Design a protein around this ligand. Structure first.
Ligand SMILES: Cc1ccccc1OCC(=O)N(C)C
Ligand SMILES: [Zn+2]
Length: 140
């Protein structure tokens, strides 16, 4: 689990979005595993606006933050896990690291702020859904 709180926006994994998220929906994209819902309270997080390929991510299944190198956001074949069927995913960044299902939503951060959230695991690569292209998160 985990979310990004920026302005009056809550950014979650689409697959973990609650009924309330869907009932307060701003934007969702199944190809990116992202859903954004509206918030009453303004949020504390800054989104990175950068092309960084190094950062640190939170891995709940280890209660640890790990420094990683990650690929630039792209369209990736996410292999079937114990939990979820195989599917293609856009705006996904990969690193070598550990991931479990409950790790989805863990933040990946660089010097500029939040880069993305853990979205894909179970087969040796940790995938992060990029948010840095979502400039609109920093306005309205
Ligand atoms: C973070 C993780 C670890 C292990 C399995 C699934 C995971 O993430 C969810 C996922 O891959 N999908 C396609 C919804
Ligand atoms: Zn950066």
């Amino acid at each position: 689990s985990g979310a990004i709180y920026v302005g009056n926006y809550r950014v979650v994994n689409r697959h973990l979005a609650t009924h309330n998220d869907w009932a307060n929906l701003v934007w969702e994209d199944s190809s990116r595993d992202l859903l954004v819902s509206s918030t009453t309270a303004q949020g504390c997080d800054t989104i990175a606006r950068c092309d960084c390929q190094t950062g640190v991510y939170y891995c709940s299944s280890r209660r640890k933050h790990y420094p990683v190198s990650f690929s630039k956001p792209s369209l990736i074949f996410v292999e079937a896990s114990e939990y979820y069927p195989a599917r293609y995913q856009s705006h996904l960044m990969l690193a070598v690291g550990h991931s479990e299902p409950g790790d989805c939503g863990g933040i990946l951060r660089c010097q500029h702020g939040v880069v993305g959230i853990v979205s894909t695991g179970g087969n040796g690569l940790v995938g992060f859904a990029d948010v840095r292209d979502l400039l609109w998160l920093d306005e309205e």
